[PDB]
């Protein structure tokens, strides 16, 4: 015996509404580092960087990190394309974003 | 056909077939020494071909640098042929013995080799052996003292051969080891963590047989001995048969936990060492992906690398929990005081611990009768079984069998001196 | 609780005596039905 | 249904030439990753670090390139990040590590290029299951 | 520095949770150099006891905070962090860390009972002193908050399987049944919560130990993404702090 | 009884595995659609005129499925009371291609909501892992429209409601029920046809040991008392 | 293979540790020539 | 292909829960605790001096009495064990009923699964499984490594309906 305030409140699960502004293209302020491995040259060091400053209001403030290269901030351009934000999600942040997720292998 | 049972008495045959058998363990010292070093490529971990003396070989470090498979061949061909000769000299023995004619009739013989039920005599045979193993035992404290080291795997670098100063010959340290309980991770004699422990161990042995084989030598048992003791041929079977077993099992356990004795850099790693390294190789891993490891927290709760033991220290997390009691030369340098020291850890790392952390996690003693390497659903593309699994497995099969024994031969004794015969 | 632990290893050890000392036993040995050597 | 040349017809350098390898070959390749690969990288996959496979296209997006084998020679020699700007030979075997990785003290040219050749031509057979593990996974 | 009390020592008795001591030396002394320069910290975290106030005849009560027993035996205590103390404009002192432990003990109600689980959290602490440097052990003060996440991660699976980001998203044991009331355990929810936390300094010393005092902190148990609500709890113990820039 | 034979008719005992293999429900179904339709009618008329009972025979907790020891196992405590239609749940995708979604098999007793294309393709599934999804039922966006009897001729978009008749779909028919009236507990229970048999053969099986014991036991008098 | 000179005798080498195994053999053949007893 | 039979029955019908597969397994353990106990006792009790040589491969038709004491037997389990009908024609049927009795039942397992009729829930637990999340019993961990086996096993194993199932989709417990 509910109402819909309580219910849909509740039939809410946070990760499975993200997966309209996810899916598409890789969230910059959450995604495990693995996921910047499906590009050219991000992975190691970038990604690494990538991770550790968010969070971002724009995609492109990716460029404004400190210490970068000059070629760095050339790629980042290339693949900003691929990129995405949103607000932070509580969950798939304090646990290790970048290993908690299955390894696969 | 009980054939072996009709020697029984006859202790002239059975000098010829104790000294038969007694050829065929030399044999098999020298079929396998030569068998391995044959099948032996250098530079290629000892425990993934599949070898087990050799590996003993090196222990005493008889020819090794730093954790070096071997800078020199030859120390292994000697042992190849000498107990492969004296496999001749034996059976020769042996064959003789046993069908050239039997014994205690020979007046001056009876004099230096007697017979059963008789407590002196018995006991005298008895403390003789025993004034052997004396002996064998003050060897191996030579081989590491005044002659061509042992090989230590602690403390430094690599730990190549070593030779030893001043055993620890505490009157105390010695027994405490055997007062010590026998479970988590505390096994009285696995225990053993300084090599130099090992040492005087073995130097109170011999003086604790010799004082002993002497004294037998001279006294024959009191009465609660007689009392107690049934004194049949077979029955000093069941006394030795059961004492084997225990061992079997002792050294089996003694096998699959590490104490120096048993560098686990020619064995393989312990069962632990691969979980505990599979720990270590990840911090590394994800450190390099910037992750702090100290607030990380894995589904439970627990933090994915780091929680505590019982008793309060740092310890890896995950099921690689139930080893937090695992010692060795690569993951302790970040121990300290309190456990992991959790500066030592993001700060002072060097490459080397990788390596080894791989390696051993890559080769777990996990294996399967096609020799099938990893986790029981892996491909056949990869062979390995680590040789301490191999040691354990048929090992323990035989203490256990033994044991069957010290039933059948005990309680054929209770048979002899009133039941069935 | 440390009054609990004392407590067993009395009962324990007490019992071990008497399967140690029950065998070494002079008096009973090892008598069966069969056959008597004392 | 047999092993054919094409199968074996695998891509050479960067720019477009080709080369097709031979069956003697091929085996080695096997032999070789199992005696020093496998161990760690069973049926294409890293162990130490599952995030990155051995798959054909996941190489052609390292830096430098690797779909070819020129790249994994290179990379056998002398390792590189998935980008290019560490040198992981103190960790990863390299004929410049030999001191360091036993396994790879004896091996030559020759070798790498038929290691190289099995890494290669798996895919082709293999497909999806050489990946991740699907029969296996 | 150096008398080594070896891993091999207390690996016996547990000393690992209980913090260093500060025994005689009340010297409270340590200078305005900070004006000076700058300043980090180490600290150790350990508690006494802890409180669990559950009691719902609502409307008549004031305060209702029964004692706990330990069922996660010597796990609390360890928390090895790393802060730095900064000056603000107005002469306080200021907390912030960097490593961010934090722990999982349970504790049995007396009462039902009923087990209780808290994630003991310290985690994005922030830290405060009242007005001036001129004084330290004196008068003692240090008070903060905490941010509070859940017991459970996202991949945690329930005895059904089915959770945020991972697990059934059904009870499958009774696939024609009614999704209104089960709805609350199918659908798991992450809580992130209020932290408050006090310190008070009983002994300071010398140069190189610095701080040890009084612990007295307050969060929220678990509520298993979607269970029971939260009972509420509140922590007291000691702890060791040690100070050292130049 | 199990097969069905003129003696073993239909609304006396129900259907048969036979028919939910078959597909033999879904084919006549189909037939009375693409030959009403060829007719001049539209989807939404079509539907609406296919007979209910039809549908129903359709249904899977029709079909002898579960249950060992279910006491007082009437059909009835498991869906609960049947009251419903004959809806056909269509599912497009975003571009507007029609989505089949797979049944499930009277041999599993849970099956992964799944969505294929006409062809065979994949299109559409409920995720386990979401963390590395990739056929979300958001990130492509379905829909579910119900073009069937009378109870549901409209459509739906919300990804919390069109997922649940995903898994309602895969029973096959989709259906409401009274589930209060008995306390159904939800799970599905057997049909008399289940249990004619079940009884029937082991008690045949238990009767081959009967005609064994008491034969030799005639033939050997003298060999019974020894 | 590292026994140099010796090389030639892989052969025999390879085969020779089983022997200790075949001793069991011969004593069931001694056995079966003198008829079991 | 048996094992594999095994497995199958594991996944979809949890055969272990049967209470008939139980009892089936009660009676070919209880052959092999009876096959034990008899043959040991005789062996064991067998009467003494009987053969001078003292091994014992002699018998004959007149050896009426045979070679063991059902007297002594009797004392030594009634002392030991507790229990011991001595009845020599008793410990021989009872010897037929464990082992029969039981495939029986067994076999008539399985003209239940015949038809998919299972012992492969527990209404009460699933029911309180459903409406709580921290509360779980052997009977639940079990349930869970079954759908493991269905759904990794059923699309090689049964190639007509062709089943093709997403990585994402499978279940998994986290790491593995
Ligand atoms: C300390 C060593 C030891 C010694 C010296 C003896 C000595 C004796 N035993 Mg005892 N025994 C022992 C250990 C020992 N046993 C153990 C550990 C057990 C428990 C298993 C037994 C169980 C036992 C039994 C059950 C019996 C004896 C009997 C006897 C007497 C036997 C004469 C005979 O007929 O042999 C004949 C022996 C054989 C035909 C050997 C069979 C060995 C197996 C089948 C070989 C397995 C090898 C396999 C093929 C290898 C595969 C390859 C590998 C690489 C994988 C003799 C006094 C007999 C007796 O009456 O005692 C007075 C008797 O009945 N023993
Ligand atoms: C562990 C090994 C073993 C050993 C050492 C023995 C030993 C013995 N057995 Mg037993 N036996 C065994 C296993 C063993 N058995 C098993 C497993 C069974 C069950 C199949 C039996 C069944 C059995 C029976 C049924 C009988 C014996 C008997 C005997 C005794 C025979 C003495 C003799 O002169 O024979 C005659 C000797 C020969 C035919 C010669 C064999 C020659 C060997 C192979 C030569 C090897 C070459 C040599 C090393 C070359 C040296 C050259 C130099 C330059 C180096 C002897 C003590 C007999 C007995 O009554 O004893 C009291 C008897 O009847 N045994
Ligand atoms: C006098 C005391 C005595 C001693 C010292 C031994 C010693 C030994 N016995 Mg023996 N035994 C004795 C009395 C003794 N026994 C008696 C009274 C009996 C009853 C008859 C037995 C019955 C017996 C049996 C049934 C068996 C043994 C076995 C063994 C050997 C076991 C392995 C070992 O411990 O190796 C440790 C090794 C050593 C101590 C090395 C000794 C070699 C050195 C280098 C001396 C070489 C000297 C040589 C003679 C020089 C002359 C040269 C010439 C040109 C002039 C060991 C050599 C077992 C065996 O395997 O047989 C060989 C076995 O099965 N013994
Ligand atoms: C387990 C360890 C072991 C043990 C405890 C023994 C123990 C023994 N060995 Mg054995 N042995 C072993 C291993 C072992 N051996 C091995 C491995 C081998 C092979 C290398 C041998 C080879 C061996 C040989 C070759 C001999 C022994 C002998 C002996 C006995 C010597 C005692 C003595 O005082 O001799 C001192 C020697 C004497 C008093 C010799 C007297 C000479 C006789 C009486 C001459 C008869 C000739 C006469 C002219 C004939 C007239 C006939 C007419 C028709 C014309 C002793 C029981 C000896 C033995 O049994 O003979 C007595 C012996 O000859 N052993
Ligand atoms: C007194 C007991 C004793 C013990 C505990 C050890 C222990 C050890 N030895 Mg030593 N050894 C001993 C006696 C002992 N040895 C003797 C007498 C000799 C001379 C024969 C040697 C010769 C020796 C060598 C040559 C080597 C070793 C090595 C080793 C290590 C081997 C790893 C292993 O597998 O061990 C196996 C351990 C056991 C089977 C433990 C048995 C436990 C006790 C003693 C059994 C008690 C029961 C027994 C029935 C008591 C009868 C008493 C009676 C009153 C009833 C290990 C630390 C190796 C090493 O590298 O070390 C430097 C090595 O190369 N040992
Ligand atoms: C080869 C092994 C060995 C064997 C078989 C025997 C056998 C015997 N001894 Mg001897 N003994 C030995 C070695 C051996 N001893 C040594 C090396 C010494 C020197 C310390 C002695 C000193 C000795 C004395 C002083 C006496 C005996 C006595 C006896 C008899 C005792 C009756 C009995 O068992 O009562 C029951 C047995 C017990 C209550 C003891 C159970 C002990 C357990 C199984 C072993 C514990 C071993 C230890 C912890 C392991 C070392 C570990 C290492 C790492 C340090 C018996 C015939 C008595 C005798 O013959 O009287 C005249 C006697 O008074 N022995
Ligand atoms: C190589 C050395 C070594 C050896 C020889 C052993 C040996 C043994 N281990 Mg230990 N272990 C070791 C290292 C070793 N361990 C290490 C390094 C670890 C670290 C993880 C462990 C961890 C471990 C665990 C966790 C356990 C064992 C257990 C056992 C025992 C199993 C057999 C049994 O059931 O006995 C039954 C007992 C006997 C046969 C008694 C022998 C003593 C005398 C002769 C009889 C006394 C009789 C009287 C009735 C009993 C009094 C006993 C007393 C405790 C009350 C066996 C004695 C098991 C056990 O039962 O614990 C003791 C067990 O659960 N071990
Ligand atoms: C031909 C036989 C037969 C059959 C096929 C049915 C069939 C049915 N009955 Mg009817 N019933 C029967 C005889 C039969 N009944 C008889 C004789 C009576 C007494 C008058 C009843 C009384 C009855 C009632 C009161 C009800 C039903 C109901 C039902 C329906 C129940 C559905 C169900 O879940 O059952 C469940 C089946 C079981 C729980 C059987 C479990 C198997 C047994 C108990 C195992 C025994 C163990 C083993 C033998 C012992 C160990 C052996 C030893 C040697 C080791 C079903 C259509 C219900 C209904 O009408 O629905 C609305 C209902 O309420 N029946
Ligand atoms: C209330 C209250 C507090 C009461 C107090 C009770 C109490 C203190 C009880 C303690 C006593 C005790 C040790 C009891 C054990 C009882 C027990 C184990 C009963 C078993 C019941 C049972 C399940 C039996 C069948 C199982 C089974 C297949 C057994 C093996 C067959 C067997 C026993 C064969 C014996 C046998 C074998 C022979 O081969 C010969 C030849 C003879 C002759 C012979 O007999
Ligand atoms: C069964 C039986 C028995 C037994 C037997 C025995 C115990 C035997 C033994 C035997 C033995 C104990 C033997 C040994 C042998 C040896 C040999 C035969 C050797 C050889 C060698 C050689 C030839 C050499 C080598 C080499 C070298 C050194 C160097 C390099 C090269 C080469 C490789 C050439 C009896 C009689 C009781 C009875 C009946 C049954």
Redesign the interface.
């Known amino acids: 015996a509910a109402t819909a305030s309580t219910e849909e409140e509740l039939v809410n699960v946070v990760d499975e509404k993200l997966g309209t502004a996810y899916g598409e293209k890789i969230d910059l302020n959450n995604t495990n580092?693995?996921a910047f491995?499906?590009?050219?040259?991000?992975?190691?060091?970038?990604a690494k960087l990538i991770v550790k400053n968010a969070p971002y209001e724009s995609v492109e403030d990716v460029l404004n990190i400190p210490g970068l290269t000059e070629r760095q901030k050339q790629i980042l351009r290339e693949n900003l394309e691929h990129f995405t934000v949103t607000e932070v999600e509580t969950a798939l942040v304090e646990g290790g974003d970048r290993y908690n997720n299955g390894?696969?292998? | 056909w009980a054939g072996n049972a009709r020697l029984i008495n006859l202790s002239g045959k059975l000098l010829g077939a104790h000294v038969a058998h007694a050829g065929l363990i030399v044999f098999w010292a020298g079929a396998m020494t030569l068998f391995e070093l044959a099948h032996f490529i250098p530079?290629?971990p000892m425990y993934e071909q599949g070898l087990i003396l050799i590996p003993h070989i090196a222990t005493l470090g008889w020819g090794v640098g730093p954790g070096g498979?071997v800078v020199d061949t030859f120390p292994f061909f000697v042992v190849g042929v000498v107990h492969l000769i004296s496999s001749a000299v034996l059976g020769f023995g042996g064959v003789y013995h046993a069908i050239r004619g039997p014994e205690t009739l020979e007046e001056y013989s009876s004099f230096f080799g007697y017979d059963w039920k008789d407590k002196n005599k018995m006991t005298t045979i008895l403390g003789f052996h025993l004034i052997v193993l004396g002996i064998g035992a003050l060897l191996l404290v030579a081989k590491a003292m005044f002659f061509g080291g042992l090989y230590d795997t602690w403390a430094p670098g690599g730990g190549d051969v070593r030779v030893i100063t001043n055993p620890t010959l505490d009157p105390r340290v010695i027994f405490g080891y055997l007062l010590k309980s026998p479970f988590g991770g505390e096994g009285w004699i696995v225990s053993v963590n300084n090599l130099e422990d090992v040492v005087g161990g073995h130097i109170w042995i011999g003086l604790i047989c010799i004082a002993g084989g002497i004294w037998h030598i001279l006294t024959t048992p009191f009465g609660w001995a007689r009392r107690a003791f049934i004194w049949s041929g077979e029955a000093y079977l069941s006394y030795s048969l059961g004492a084997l077993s225990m061992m079997g099992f002792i050294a089996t356990c003694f096998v699959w936990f590490n104490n120096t004795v048993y560098p686990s850099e020619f064995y393989g790693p312990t069962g632990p060492e691969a979980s505990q390294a599979q720990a270590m190789?990840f911090l590394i891993?994800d450190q390099k992906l910037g992750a702090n490891v100290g607030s990380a927290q894995g589904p439970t709760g627990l933090g994915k690398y780091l929680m505590r033991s019982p008793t309060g220290e740092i310890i890896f997390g995950g099921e690689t929990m139930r080893f937090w009691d695992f010692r060795g030369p690569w993951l302790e340098p970040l121990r300290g005081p309190n456990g992991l020291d959790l500066n030592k850890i993001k700060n002072d790392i060097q490459?080397?611990q990788?390596?080894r952390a791989?390696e051993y996690?890559?080769?777990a003693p996990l294996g399967s009768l096609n020799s099938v390497?990893?986790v029981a659903?892996?491909?056949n593309?990869?062979?390995?079984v680590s040789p301490r699994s191999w040691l354990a497995t048929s090992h323990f099969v035989l203490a256990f069998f033994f044991l069957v024994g010290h039933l059948w031969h005990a309680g054929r004794a209770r048979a002899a001196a009133a039941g069935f015969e | 609780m440390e009054t609990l632990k004392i407590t067993v290893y009395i009962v324990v050890t007490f019992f071990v005596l008497l399967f140690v000392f029950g065998f070494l036993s002079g008096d009973p040995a090892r008598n069966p039905k069969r056959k008597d050597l004392e | 249904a047999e092993l054919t040349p094409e199968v074996l017809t695998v891509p050479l350098n960067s720019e477009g030439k080709t080369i097709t390898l031979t069956e003697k070959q091929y085996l080695e390749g096997?032999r070789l990753?199992?005696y020093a690969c496998?161990?760690?990288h069973?049926?294409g996959?890293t162990?130490?670090?599952?995030?990155?496979d051995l798959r054909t296209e996941?190489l052609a997006?390292?830096?430098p390139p690797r779909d070819n084998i020129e790249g994994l020679v290179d990379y056998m020699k002398n390792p590189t990040?998935?980008?290019?700007?560490?040198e992981i030979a103190?960790?990863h075997p390299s004929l410049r590590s030999a001191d360091?990785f036993?396994?790879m003290?004896?091996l030559t040219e020759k070798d790498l290029v038929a290691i190289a050749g099995h890494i290669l031509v798996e895919p082709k057979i293999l497909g999806d299951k050489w990946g991740?593990?699907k029969?296996?996974? | 520095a150096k008398q080594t009390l070896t891993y091999d020592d207390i690996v016996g008795t547990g000393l690992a949770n209980k913090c260093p001591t500060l025994d005689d030396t009340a010297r409270g002394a340590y200078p305005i150099d900070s004006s000076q320069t700058y300043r980090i910290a180490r600290l150790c975290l350990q508690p006494t006891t802890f409180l669990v106030k559950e009691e719902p005849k609502n409307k008549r009560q004031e305060a209702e905070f029964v004692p706990t027993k330990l069922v996660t035996r010597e796990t609390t205590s360890l928390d090895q962090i790393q802060g730095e103390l900064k000056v603000n404009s107005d002469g306080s002192l200021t907390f912030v860390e960097e490593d961010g432990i934090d722990f999982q003990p349970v504790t049995v109600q007396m009462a039902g009972g009923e087990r209780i689980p808290l994630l003991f959290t310290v985690k994005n602490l922030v830290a405060s002193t009242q007005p001036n440097v001129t004084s330290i052990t004196t008068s003692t003060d240090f008070k903060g908050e905490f941010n509070v996440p859940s017991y459970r991660t996202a991949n945690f699976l329930d005895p059904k399987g089915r959770g945020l980001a991972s697990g059934y998203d059904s009870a499958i044991a009774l696939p024609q049944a009614k999704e209104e009331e089960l709805a609350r355990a199918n659908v798991k929810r992450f809580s992130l919560t209020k932290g408050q936390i006090s310190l008070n300094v009983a002994k300071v010393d010398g140069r190189t130990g610095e701080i040890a005092g009084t612990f007295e902190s307050e969060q929220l148990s678990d509520d298993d993404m979607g269970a029971h609500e939260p009972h509420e709890v509140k922590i007291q113990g000691v702890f060791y702090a040690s100070i050292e820039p130049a | 009884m199990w097969y069905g034979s003129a003696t073993t008719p239909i609304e006396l005992f129900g259907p048969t595995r036979y028919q939910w293999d078959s597909s033999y429900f879904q084919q006549e179904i189909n037939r009375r659609v693409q030959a009403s339709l060829a007719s001049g009618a539209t989807l939404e008329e079509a539907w609406s005129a296919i007979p209910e009972k039809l549908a129903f025979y359709d249904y899977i907790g029709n079909n002898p499925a579960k249950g060992g020891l279910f006491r007082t196992g009437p059909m009835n405590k498991g869906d609960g009371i049947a009251q419903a239609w004959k809806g056909h749940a269509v599912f497009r995708n975003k571009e507007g291609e029609e989505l089949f979604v797979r049944r499930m098999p009277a041999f599993f007793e849970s099956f992964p909501v799944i969505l294929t294309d006409k062809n065979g393709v994949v299109k559409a599934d409920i995720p386990f892992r979401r963390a590395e999804s990739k056929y979300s039922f958001e990130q492509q966006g379905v829909t579910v429209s119900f073009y069937g009897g009378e109870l549901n001729g409209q459509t739906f978009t919300d990804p919390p409601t069109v997922k649940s008749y995903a898994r309602k779909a895969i029973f096959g028919e989709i259906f409401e029920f009274d589930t209060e009236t008995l306390n159904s507990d939800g799970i599905f229970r057997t049909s008399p046809r289940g249990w004619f048999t079940f009884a029937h053969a082991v008690f045949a099986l238990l009767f081959f040991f009967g005609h064994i014991w008491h034969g030799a036991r005639t033939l050997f008098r003298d060999v019974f008392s020894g | 293979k590292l026994p140099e000179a010796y090389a030639i005798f892989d052969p025999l080498v390879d085969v020779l540790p089983v022997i200790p195994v075949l001793f069991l053999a011969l004593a069931f053949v001694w056995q079966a020539a003198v008829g079991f007893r | 292909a048996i094992f594999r039979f095994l497995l199958f029955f594991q996944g979809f019908h949890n055969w272990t829960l049967n209470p008939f597969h139980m009892m089936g397994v009660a009676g070919v353990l209880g052959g092999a605790l009876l096959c034990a106990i008899h043959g040991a006792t005789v062996e064991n009790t067998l009467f003494q001096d009987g053969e001078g040589a003292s091994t014992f491969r002699a018998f004959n038709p007149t050896q009426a009495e045979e070679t063991y004491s059902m007297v002594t037997a009797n004392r030594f389990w009634s002392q030991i064990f507790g229990i011991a009908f001595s009845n020599k024609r008793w410990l021989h049927f009872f010897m037929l009923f464990v082992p029969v009795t039981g495939l029986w039942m067994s076999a008539i397992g399985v003209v239940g699964l015949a038809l998919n009729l299972r012992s492969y829930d527990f209404i009460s637990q699933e029911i309180r499984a459903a409406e709580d999340p921290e509360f779980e019993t052997f009977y639940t961990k079990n349930l869970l490594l079954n759908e493991g086996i269905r759904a990794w096993m059923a699309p090689?194993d049964q190639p007509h309906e062709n089943f093709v199932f997403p990585?994402e989709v499978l279940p998994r417990g986290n790491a593995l």
């Not at chain 4, 162990?47 to 990155?52: A, E, F, G, Q, V």
């Not at chain 4, 990040?81 to 560490?86: A, M, S």
Request: proline share 5%.
């Open positions: 580092i693995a491995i499906q590009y050219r040259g991000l992975y190691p060091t970038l390894l696969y292998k | 530079e290629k498979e190789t891993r490459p080397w990788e390596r791989a996690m890559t080769h390497g990893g659903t892996e491909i593309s990869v062979n390995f | 096997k990753f199992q496998a161990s760690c069973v049926g996959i162990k130490t670090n599952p995030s990155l996941t997006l390292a830096t990040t998935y980008d290019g700007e560490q103190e960790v360091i036993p396994k003290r004896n991740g593990g029969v296996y996974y | 090689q990585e």
